[PDB]
Every structure is written in structure tokens, then in C-alpha cells.
Design a protein around this ligand. Sequence first.
Ligand code: FAD
Ligand code: MCN
Ligand code: MCN
Ligand code: FES
Ligand code: FES
Ligand code: FES
Ligand code: FES
Lengths: 153, 153, 783, 160, 53, 289
Amino acid sequence: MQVTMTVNGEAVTADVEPRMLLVHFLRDQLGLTGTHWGCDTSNCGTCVVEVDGEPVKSCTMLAAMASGHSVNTVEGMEVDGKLDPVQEGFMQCHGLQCGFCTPGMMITARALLRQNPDPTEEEIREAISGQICRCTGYTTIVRSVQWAARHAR
Amino acid sequence: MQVTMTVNGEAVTADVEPRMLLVHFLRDQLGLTGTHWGCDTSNCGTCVVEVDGEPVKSCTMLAAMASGHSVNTVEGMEVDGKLDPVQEGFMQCHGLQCGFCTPGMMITARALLRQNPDPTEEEIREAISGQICRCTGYTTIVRSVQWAARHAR
Amino acid sequence: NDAKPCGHGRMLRKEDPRFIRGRGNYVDDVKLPGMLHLAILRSPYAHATINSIDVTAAQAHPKVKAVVTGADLAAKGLAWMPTLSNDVQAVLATDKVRFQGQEVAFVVAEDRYSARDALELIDVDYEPLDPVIDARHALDPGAPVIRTDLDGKTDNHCFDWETGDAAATDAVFAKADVVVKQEMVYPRVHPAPMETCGAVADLDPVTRKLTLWSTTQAPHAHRTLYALVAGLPEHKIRVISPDIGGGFGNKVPIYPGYVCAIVGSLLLGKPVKWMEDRSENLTSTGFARDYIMVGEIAATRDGKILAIRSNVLADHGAFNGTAAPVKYPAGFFGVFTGSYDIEAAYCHMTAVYTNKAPGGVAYACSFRITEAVYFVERLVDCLAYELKMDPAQLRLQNLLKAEQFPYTSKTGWVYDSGDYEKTMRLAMEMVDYEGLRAEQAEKRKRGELMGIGMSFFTEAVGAGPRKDMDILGLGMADGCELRVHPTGKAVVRLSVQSQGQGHETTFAQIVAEELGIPPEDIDVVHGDTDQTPFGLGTYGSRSTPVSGAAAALVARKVRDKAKIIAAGMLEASIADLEWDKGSFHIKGDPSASVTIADIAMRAHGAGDLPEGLEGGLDAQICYNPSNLTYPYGAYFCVVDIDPGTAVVKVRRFVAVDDCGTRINPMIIEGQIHGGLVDGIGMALMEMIAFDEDGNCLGGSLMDYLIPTAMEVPHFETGHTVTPSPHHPIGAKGIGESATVGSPPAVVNAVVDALAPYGVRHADMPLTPSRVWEAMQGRATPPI
Amino acid sequence: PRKDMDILGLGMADGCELRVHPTGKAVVRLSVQSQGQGHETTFAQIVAEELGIPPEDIDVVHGDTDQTPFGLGTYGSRSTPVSGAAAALVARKVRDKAKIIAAGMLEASIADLEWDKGSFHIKGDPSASVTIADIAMRAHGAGDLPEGLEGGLDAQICYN
Amino acid sequence: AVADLDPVTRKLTLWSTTQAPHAHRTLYALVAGLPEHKIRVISPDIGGGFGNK
Amino acid sequence: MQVPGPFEYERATSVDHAVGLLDRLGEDARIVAGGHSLLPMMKLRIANPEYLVDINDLAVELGYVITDPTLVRIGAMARHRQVLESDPLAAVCPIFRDAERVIADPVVRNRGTLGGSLCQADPAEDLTTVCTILGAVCLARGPGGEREIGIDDFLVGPYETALAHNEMLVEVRIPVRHRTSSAYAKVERRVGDWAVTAAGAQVTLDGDSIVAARVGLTAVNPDPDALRALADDLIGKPATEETFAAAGELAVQACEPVTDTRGSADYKRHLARELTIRTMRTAVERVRT
Ligand SMILES: Cc1cc2nc3c(=O)[nH]c(=O)nc-3n(C[C@H](O)[C@H](O)[C@H](O)COP(=O)(O)OP(=O)(O)OC[C@H]3O[C@@H](n4cnc5c(N)ncnc54)[C@H](O)[C@@H]3O)c2cc1C
Ligand SMILES: Nc1ccn([C@@H]2O[C@H](COP(=O)(O)OP(=O)(O)OC[C@H]3Oc4nc5nc(N)nc(O)c5nc4C(S)=C3S)[C@@H](O)[C@H]2O)c(=O)n1
Ligand SMILES: Nc1ccn([C@@H]2O[C@H](COP(=O)(O)OP(=O)(O)OC[C@H]3Oc4nc5nc(N)nc(O)c5nc4C(S)=C3S)[C@@H](O)[C@H]2O)c(=O)n1
Ligand code: FES
Ligand code: FES
Ligand code: FES
Ligand code: FES
């Protein structure tokens, strides 16, 4: 089937099987390997992407369903050579180690900071509570998000 | 423009500009990088491919012209994991050093051996006289072709 | 050739399986995601001020991603780049174009075709200037000053060089019975590898790591030079020299196109591929030769060569791009005294700038040794002509004797070893010199023109001791790493870069010889600077003298360490261990033996190793040559000249080469044969000619004629083995030997054939027209 | 210790290679494989500490067995005890060689050289100093090196 | 693991989520009989190992 | 590599389709046969046709080499290889085999065509000389219809023929006469190189005298008037060495060679003479065998 959607601000059209999960369409078809997958049960959150401005598990969305929608990934987060404050905060605060969950984590953190300019640690933890990080212990992720929030201010 | 041709026995169809030289369509479009190019004036012969069974300078043929024709390259020479006798002779007789001319040279040598099972050294020289080898001195190429001829016999 | 020796000897090349299948990976094969294509707008003028460059139309091309001019580079400080000779050279022409085909601008576009179209779109306003094309008049008063870029430059003088003793040579000439003076030209020719130069520059925009796939013979040199020139951090530069489709010295320099690909990638954050077309290659990359040499040879009436004097006018192009060691601006031309015992020698060389592409050291010249050898062998044939003595007899009486070695030449070169008479006599027997002379005399009776030409040459290859030889400050010592894997397979990482010379086989053989690991079990790694030790690369036939020596020595280091480990394993004293090609065994008990594979596993294995020993079976070396190697050759060419058309046909070529210990005779044969074809090409047809307006007349393979299989005979080769004493395995370089020695052999053969016309000298190229003009008594140099 | 600890017969000693490029940038090749533990930073820091080359000037290479020395990889928190020790020691080997080269360059006895975080200077005159980058260039450069010394500023170690 | 055994060169390039790429290369040589000098284990960025790899 | 500028491509399904394409497309349309003259020019951007009418599909209809007792007909789409390999042609017009053997290289010969060489009308190239020597009649066809152009008329200037923009060369018709043969000799710096100088000769022998003769010169800028004067002077002469020498002298006078990379003008004149003599002798020996 033909699907058309805006991926990181660029219109894209592709022939996909209806069953193609969005994460696979992004990674494989569009080569946007910043988006990851780590589970079969929509649990890990490593595939979180922005669909119409909202963090979505791309593993739990068909590319066909994303058709007509704007899909934003970690690749689109650095704009005009400038890191989004979430990315810079993650680097500055050691909010990543292996970096696998980072794309999703930063997509979620950017969405949160958009809707909440000054989140609390509890709000940050809740906002990322659907995304597993095995490496960081989440405290540095909270610090990264606070850093991005405070620099955006 | 659309062009359809058989490349190494596989039907291929592609959208090419009319001006696309066959060598570029093979190397760049079809990723058949075995075929080389080394000149602008149809002189070096490193682009020689087999169009309809005859050595042709693919640099002096438009892909659009090859449409409807069978194009064979060095990639197609090894059949069912079995080296063509030209390839084996080139390895056995040191008929190549840098290998750049070798695709064209072996295409020409295979065509010659097809039309002439037992070529003399002069016939080999003449048959490859349109193809420049900077490395070998051509004596090992003649030996390679003799080796392929004698093993094919 | 299908033998499988564990070490030196004939064996199938390990590169062939992939090449014969079209699976080589040459630079133009490199397809990277998002790769853009770079095309360079070249100057149409040999010498013209650039008034202005309009790139608006090219920029407006919908497929063009960037248009860059010399002004844009100068803003980035990359409009100029050092040459290998410590000169500077325009990356893109900024003030003026100093040669036709010189880089003026470049366009990065979506594909190669669109890039070339865009080049057509660029408008450059030139103010043409008088070109300096005739190197003879470059220094004339009022000649246009090419190098106005240089502060205070008022002439086209590049440099003055001299070697030997002027006064000693003058005194010998004053006392000489016979003094023969001959001007001879070594016309500008080109390495012309079948693969043109190219570079895929992928400067990863995030990691900032430059991965530069390049047709470079010296990827490490190039990496270091890029770090120095572009300011890029060297640890973030990975020069990948993939399979190279022939270098022949053409791919030693850093060309402006490589820099332009790097800049394109920097600017666009995308991989940028620049693959030069043949015309760009012929007209802008390194030429070779282009010497005008007045030789004078002083001898006794009996043929004892006493002195040799050389006065060289070297045409170096717009910039001195000669790829030569810093202390040797004229390269190794000092070996112009050749293989002969002479009393004195003096050479003075004037290098001048002309409105032509830079270069000069390329095309298997062994650093101008092609020029020196042609000079001396042509001059010796002139001397024989004058003495009316058989050139073979002349040479044989003047040749250095074996007991004279190590021989310090009159120009300061210390020849390592050689038995010249043995090799020369071998060549004469193989070619049947006297039988050829009888046949030639009979033919002259019949009016047919048969020429027998010969050359005896001493090469000087393997640059070289760092104390003397450095490229832009980089000592010419080669690193080599050897690593025996736990399972006993090995990897040798080289700093040399094959362009077809079979390194992946021969270095496997060197290591196999030292270590007893079969060559098939030795992966030879080269060309990728991220996984190879630093070294100066492959040119000047230095791979075997320098990197080969290093490989042998590192294999021996691994063998010594393996001996320590094996003595531990055999529970024996290190003194009681005998090495047996791959294995250590206790003396008197071969059964108490352990293979290098067992030792490799043990070196990585459990249990303490011998005290003070680190685990693993790795070793490395940086081999600094004590001296060059001096392979030598006795080449005999037989030519027929059609007396009506003056068409020269090379009927025979016997090349007898002595490169010391032979690693791989089949590869050695290939190297010679290729060199013989080069010599025939230079002697007979090859030339990059320029018209009075400065237009390069050899900008294509239509105009630069490279020998086909039909121009060259079935080559015959012999050999003698006179090992280099200072080399760990006694091997000398061979790669350039044939190219060095064959041109004078072919020219001597043509001149000898022209003997009935009273021709003592005719200059290459010996085209039908030029040979016929020589027949008419009107022999003139092409320049 | 390989005498005690081996994985399927592979002694658990780690190789590490250090190579200072002519321009003074370095590459350390590790036998450890990060899965997020920051080796590309920390091993740069270990070498930087020993050699005075800034970590940003040290490329840490790992995970690709075609360009890294043999070692047992990363598990058992061994990367720093084993590969870290190896990296420190190989950096020190490079520093000792560099001291030889620097003593040559300063035309001084090796004893009169003092190491100063990235540079050797004659004791007394800090001004008679040469950096590791200068020494790296010299190690690849023209002119004879000190007698018995091979060029290059590379070292390797198998730390047990 | 992306196993790319180049059919021609016979070189195995094994992109793997391995914490011990050299140990793995040696073990592959021993287990599959592949020549170890023709095995390149590439452990790329690993998304967390924790011993699992 | 140097690559062509953009153009539009058309594949002619017949001679009439090709002629119609040239008529509709106009002056800026060019036929592409083997492309071994056009394509290099376009790659160098010397030639920039808006349209190429590929007539390679006419290689069967127009790729014939037909030898009748009084007429050799060679299709425009005849590959140089076909002309070189035609043993009957070699029996009747050996000049063709002579030139073909020394034209370009075997790979180029596989593609380049007699029609392509002729319409290229390159004075430095050999087939125009061969077809001039043999008194060929080109058969052109355009929207107006089919017509016959004498080879001298067809070759109106350097790179220019009598063919209109909407006309295509279909076949070249070469009269065959008894006791007639021909030869071609070329001097090139290298195999595949264009002639340093080439000469061709077709002679008719009545007993031992010359009944008809034509000498063509390649790459030397022959004067057709002087060449015709030489040919007329050869009439009725014995087929001896003195006649060949006189013809060589006339050929020396019949050309205006230019000193260039291929050789000195004096060498070109010497070659005009020597190759004229060689070709005349070869043609005579071929008549007498
Ligand atoms: C490396 C090389 C070496 C060569 N050496 C020689 C040599 O030594 N001697 C020599 O004589 N030639 C030589 N050639 C030229 C070769 O003979 C010609 O290029 C070739 O014959 C042209 O034929 P073609 O069919 O390829 O022509 P094309 O390139 O297809 O056509 C050439 C011109 O003729 C026109 N044309 C073609 N067919 C027709 C037709 N049927 N009717 C009307 N117009 C037509 C085209 O439109 C174009 O203007 C060489 C070429 C190369 C590439
Ligand atoms: N005693 C010896 C010497 C050499 N060899 C083998 O011969 C080959 C050539 O060795 P060497 O003489 O060291 O020359 P390089 O390898 O340094 O090659 C450079 C040399 O190589 C020449 N020949 C070439 N051949 C090919 N195919 N391509 C080039 O670019 C070439 N460039 C030219 C030029 S120019 C030069 S400098 C190596 O495999 C070597 O092991 C050997 O078996 N025994
Ligand atoms: N004194 C020290 C010790 C260590 N470090 C730094 O801490 C890191 C961890 O070092 P080390 O303790 O040597 O452990 P390894 O690097 O060998 O990591 C292995 C260890 O790492 C652990 N942490 C992990 N963290 C991440 N992100 N991913 C895994 O897979 C991890 N796997 C687990 C498991 S399981 C184990 S075995 C390294 O950057 C090191 O330089 C330091 O700065 N100072
Ligand atoms: S892949 Fe685990 S939540 Fe989507
Ligand atoms: S950084 Fe490794 S899973 Fe979060
Ligand atoms: S690329 Fe040179 S003949 Fe085709
Ligand atoms: S093998 Fe190098 S050009 Fe032929």
C-alpha cells in the first residue's frame, strides 16, 4: 500500500505492507536508525517517536496508520546544526550510556518540556515511565531533562 | 527514459537519462562496479562489456541504446560458483596486477575464445589491442588467454 | 604459479580471486549514502589572469549543491597547498591559471552528469597571458613570470642543483682522449594509470571524522599531510586507499581534487566523490620526465670511461610538485654515473617553471633515476658510436666489479652490491648478442633496418635512511605490524600501498618465510590508515627494500618471542630449541616440537608465560634502511624500422634483472614486463606535447599514446641474485627497474638501427615522423 | 591473572595499543568493548593522563577485531583493572620512548629530562621543552633518531 | 548479528552484539573452522550488554 | 569521465521512421549508429544534438554487405567488423579489409559503422578515403524520397556531407570491375591511432597497362583535383614500379599535409608518396593474383 507522511519535516511517500510497523518503516525503509526497538509488547519505549507532536511507540503503530501524519524522530531533533536542549542536556548530564533508549527518551523529554516548561523530577519520571533505561539509573536522565528545561528557560 | 535490458542474464528495467552512458548505468545505477572506465575518448577499453555477445566499450554506448539488448559484464563471468576459464587463466598466468583493465580484458578474451578456440599470440594481441593494460606488459595477458584457451579445449 | 610455498617463491596472488570477478574495490566503486559528485572546472588557458568567476548559473542548477572557487578556498585558507617539494600549488587557481587543465572551480552536484553540466554553466573571465611553454626560453629575459604568487620572483627559475665535483670533472675532461657531447631530451610523459585519480571524501558531519577513500600510493603520508594542510585532527582522518587501478607514481601526490572533495564534504555534510576524467588526469596530475640533458662523457681512446658531466634543464611545470625526498630536489639523478667505474662526475641541473601541470617524479622514475639512466646509457652509446666500439664491449669494460662493492660512486651514492658483468653476460647470451649482430649486418646488406640497443643500469631504490631521505619532513622508514591470532593465523599490517604490485601475496610470503605460517594464513592489510602502521607508502620501488625488510624483521621478532614461549612449553632451555619453519623443537627430539599456532594459542592461553614476557604474539617494527638497494639490469632491445615509413617495431626485449633475493618470481616478472611496456611507450610514442599557445596536446588517450599489446613483443627475462647485504632478506626493489632501464635500451636500439643514416642520437618519442626526420639527418628534440 | 583465569583457554590478559600520529594526535586500540560504559572517554583519559595528549586528541578504538589487539572483552568490570592498566602502561611506554627521542631533540642526557604533562624539558630550563606532538613528528621525521631506537611513537602491551 | 561471509574473499565480517569480539572471533574460528584471520568481528555501538552479550 | 550534455533519445524502428524522426525533430536531431564518432564528441561536448535517432535497430535491414558481380552494396548500419570479416567483400574490394584491419580496434569495429564513418566525413579517417577511392555511390533517403549521391558529391567538406538534416545514408554502392583490385596502407603512431597518413588505391589492369586508377589520401588534406589528375595520368601506363613512383610523386604534390602531433608535414608528404606506391603495388599484385 502507498503511505504518505511527513518525517522530520520532509514529505515521504512509500510502498509498505499494511502490517509494517512504523518503527520498521522508519528504520528500515527510511533508514532513520535513530529510532530503536527493544520489545514485542510495547513495553520498552525505545521506539518512541513523535507522531503529530506526541510521543508514540512506533512499534505499536503501523506505517499505514502514520500515513497523513507528521512523524518526528531523534534525527530531526538537531535543527540547523543546533542540538535541541534535550540532546545537549543528555550529553551534559550523562543521561545516556549505551544510548539505546536515548532517542525515545529525548523524544519524550522534548514533548514533556514543550507541554511543561519547568517539570518536577516526579513529572519527568512519570513522563518517561513508559521508557526503560537499563544503563543510567534514570537519575541522570532526570538531570538531563532538568538541564534542558532550565536552559530552554 | 525507461530502458529494459538483460544484464548478466537478469532482466533489468530502469529510469535513465537518455545521455547516460552504459558504463555509468552498469556501475552507478546497477552497482555492477566490475566494469571500469578510464578515458573520455573510447580509447582505454577498461569499460568493455559484452553487448549481444560482442565486446563493446560501454563508455561509448548509451544505456538507452543498450535497451532491448543483453549486456554481460565480468560479474556474470563466474557461473554457478565456477570461474570462467578466462578468469582462471588470468589468475594462473598473472594476467592482472591492479586489475583495472582485467574486466574488459577478460570480456574481450572470453569473446575471442568463443569465436576462436585456439588463438595465436598475435590473434590475442589483436583482439585486446583496443584495451590498455598499464601493469602487466600484456605478455602475461596473452599467457592467461592461452591458458584459458588450452583448458577450455 | 599455482604452487603453495610457505614463503618466497611462485604462488597465485591473493588479490586475483576478487579482481578476476570484478570485485575489486576501487575508489569509483565507492557508493556512500547521500554521496554527491564533484566536477572541477579546469582552466582553458596555459597562463591567464582570472579577472572574475561567475558561478551564479552553475549554482542555480537544480541538481548542483555547491559551487566553490579559489576565492572561497582562500577564505578557508585552502586555495594553496604545499607540494611534496616544499613548493606551494594552487588548490583552485585564484590569481591566474598557470597551466591549461589547472583547477579553477568545482561544482558539487547530485550526480556526475549534472556536475559536468554545471561546470559548463560556470563563466570565468580570463585575461590570457603569454605562456612559458618552451623550457629552453623560460629563463630568457622578459619571459613572463609564472610564479608571481611568490614574493619578489622575477624569473621562471625553480632551483639549481649539483652533484659530484666540477673541478675534478673539468680536469679529467681536459686530460681525456675522447670527449663526446650529446644533448638528449627525456620528453614529458605521464604515468597514465588506467584508473584515474579520485577521492570519496566523507567528512561525517557529526563525529567530524574524515574518511577519505583515495587513489593514494601513500595513504599515511596523505593523512598526515591532510592533517597539516586542512588542520583536520589526524586521529580523525582515515585515509582508505582501496584497490588502486595502477599508480605508477601518479597517485603519490595530493592533488587539488582530493582537497576539493574534502571541502565539498565539509561544506555539504555529505560524502563527495571526485573522480577525475582522463583529460584532467593527463593535463593536471603529475607528469614525468621532461628533462633536457646535455651529457659529456670523457674517456680514453680505449674506452675507459673517465668522467661524466651532466647539465640538466628540468621543466617542473607551474609549481615544483616533484615527489622527491627533501634533501634530494633533483631526486636520485646523481646515479647518472650509472653502473660504471669512472674517475669523476659532475652534474648541474636547472629546474625552471613553465605553464604546465606540476610533477616530474612519476611514471616509475625512481626519483629521476629513469632520467639518470637514460642519460648515461644514451651517452655511453654515443661514446661507443664515437669510439666505433661495440656498446656491449664499452659497458663491460667500464662496469663496476663485484669486489668494488659497497661502492661509493663519484656522486656520493654507495651501491650496496652487484655482479654487473655476470648479469650483462647473462643478458647477452640470452639475447644472443653476437648472433643478433650477424643478423643485423646481413639485414643491412639487404637494406632493412635492424637495431640492437642495450642498457646496463643500476637502480637506487628503497628510500630510505631517515637521516637523508624524508618526504616533507617524514622520514622514509616503514612501520610494519605482525599479529599471530590465537588460532595461529596471522595479520601483517603494512604502511605500503599496492596499486597492483601484489603486496597481499609477497608480504604474506616474507612473513611466511620467517614464521612458517602459510601465506594463505597471513592476511596482508594495507591502504587503510586506521588499521595500518605509519609508513611512507609505495613509490620508488621502496615497498620490498623498506616495508619488506620491516616485515621480515617483525616476523623474526615474533619468532624470537615465540621461541621464548615455546621453550616454556617444551619445558626446555631457550638454547635447546631449534626453529624448524613453523615450529620449535628440542634439539635432537623433533617430536618434542610446538608449532607457531600452538605457541600463539599459548601466548593467549592459560597459565603463566615465561617470566618478564607479555602475552600475545604481536610485534611491530619501524624499519629505517641503512642504505638504498641497488638492483641492476642488463636490457637488450631488438627493433625493426621500416626504411620507407620509419615505423619502429620492437621485435625483442630481453631484460635481465638482479633485485637480490626474489620473493615471488611471477610477480617480479609481471613488474618487469609492465616496466618494459612503459619504456617502449616512452621510447616510441608517449609524449605530452604543448603547442606555442600552451594548449596541452596530450590531454587524452587519443593524443597520449600508450602501447597496446600490439606494440610490444613477447618479453623475455632472466635474472641473477645478488642480495642486498643490508636487507634482512637480501631483496632489492624491482618495481621501477624495467621502466628505468628499458627506455635507453629502446632508444639505443632505434639509434643503432639508424646507424646506416649516420645517426648518433635521436630523441624520444621515436614516432614514425621523428624517426624519419632522424633518417633525413634532421634529428631534432620534440622540445 | 592468566595463570588462574582463562575463558575457554584464553588467558584473561588484555592487549592495548597506543599510536601517536606524526601530528601528535593519538589512537589507543582496546581489547575491551563498551556497551555504554564510556570507554571512548575514559581510556582517552587514562592515556591523556600518562601522555599529556588531551583526551579529545585520543581516538579510542574498540569492538572491531580487525584493528584492535586481542583481549578478553568487557565483562566482570574488568575493562579498567585490566585494559585500563594496560592502557596506562602502554601510554607510559610511549612516554619513555618519547623521552629518549626528546633527549635527542634537546641534545641532552635522558637523565636531565623532566616530564611535564605532555612535554619533556631539560631540568632547570622549562623553556628547553618539546611536546609529545613535537616528539611524535620527530619520531616520524627526518634525521637519525637516538641509536638503537626505532621510529614511530607506538607501543603495545598485553597486561596480565 | 549481521553475518556477511563475503562469498569470494571468504572473509566473515560479523557485526555482533558481543561484549568480547576478540574472544568471539577466536571461538568462531574454533567452532566453525573459519580461518581466524578471515574473521572480522565488528562489535558496533552496543545498546547495553549487562553480560547478556 | 567526460559525459554528454542532456539530449532526447529516439529509437528508429525503420528507415522511414528514422527519416520521419529527423524531419519532425529537425536540424538539431542527429542519427546515432555505433556512436563511436558522435558519442565521443558529445562526451567532450563538441557535439550537442538535441535529439539522437538511434538507428541500431536498423542494423539488420541496413547492415548487409552484398557482393553482386558488378556492384558491392554495403549497408550504412554495417559494422566495421562485418566489413572486415566479409571474405567475399575482401575478394572484390580488399581495400575495405586493409582499412578495417587498421581502423580503431576490434571493440570499436564491433560498433562503428560504414554509414557512421562516412557521415562523420572526417578527413583524418580512413573509410571516407576508401569509399572515395572505390568511386562509391551513397544512397541517401529522406522524407522527399531516395536518391543517389556520388562519393565526391557526398563528401562536401570536413565533417560535412551532401545529406540533408532529414536524410539518412542507407547504403553505399561501389562498382565492381574485372581486373580491378585495391589496397589501403596506413601509418599510425599506435595501433588504433588515426592515420598519421594513409593512402589507398584502386587500379584496373588491361593486360599490364592501367585502364583506370584512383588514389586517395587520408589525413594529408588531399586535393581532389590533383588526385584526379594523378589518376588520369595513370591511365594506360604499365603496372610497373616506375608508374608507382611517378604516382607517388604526384601524390606528394596532391596533398597539403600539416605538421602536427602525428608528424611533420614533410614526413606526411613522404608518406603520401611511399604509401601511394605501396597501395598501388599491392592493388596491382592483388589484380594479378
Ligand atoms: C578509439 C577510436 C579509434 C578510431 N580510429 C579510427 C581510425 O583509425 N580510422 C578511422 O577511420 N576511424 C577511426 N575511428 C572512428 C570510427 O571509425 C568511427 O567513429 C565510426 O565508424 C563511426 O561510425 P558510427 O556508426 O559509430 O557513427 P556515429 O558516431 O553513430 O555517427 C557519426 C556521424 O554520422 C551520422 N550518421 C551515422 N550513421 C548515419 C546514417 N546511416 N545516415 C546518416 N548519418 C549517419 C551521425 O548522425 C553522426 O553525425 C576511431 C574511433 C575510436 C573511438
Ligand atoms: N626482490 C624482490 C622485489 C620485489 N618483489 C615483488 O615485486 C613487487 C614490487 O616490489 P617493489 O620493487 O618493492 O616495488 P613497490 O612494490 O614499491 O612498487 C612500486 C613500483 O611499482 C611499479 N609497478 C607497478 N605495478 C603495478 N601493477 N602498478 C603500479 O602502480 C606500479 N607502479 C610502479 C612504480 S611507479 C613503482 S615505485 C612486490 O610484490 C614485491 O614483493 C619480489 O618478489 N622480490
Ligand atoms: N576506577 C574506575 C573504574 C571504572 N571507571 C569507569 O567506569 C566504566 C566502567 O569500568 P569498569 O568497572 O572497568 O567496567 P567495564 O567497563 O568493564 O564494564 C563492565 C561492567 O559494566 C556494567 N555497566 C554497564 N553499563 C552500561 N551502560 N552497559 C552495560 O552493558 C553495562 N554492563 C555492566 C556489566 S554486566 C559489567 S561487567 C569505564 O568507563 C571506566 O573507565 C572509572 O572512571 N574509574
Ligand atoms: S519496541 Fe518496545 S515499546 Fe516499542
Ligand atoms: S542508555 Fe542504555 S538503555 Fe538507556
Ligand atoms: S572508458 Fe576508456 S574506452 Fe571506455
Ligand atoms: S592490470 Fe593494471 S591496467 Fe591492466
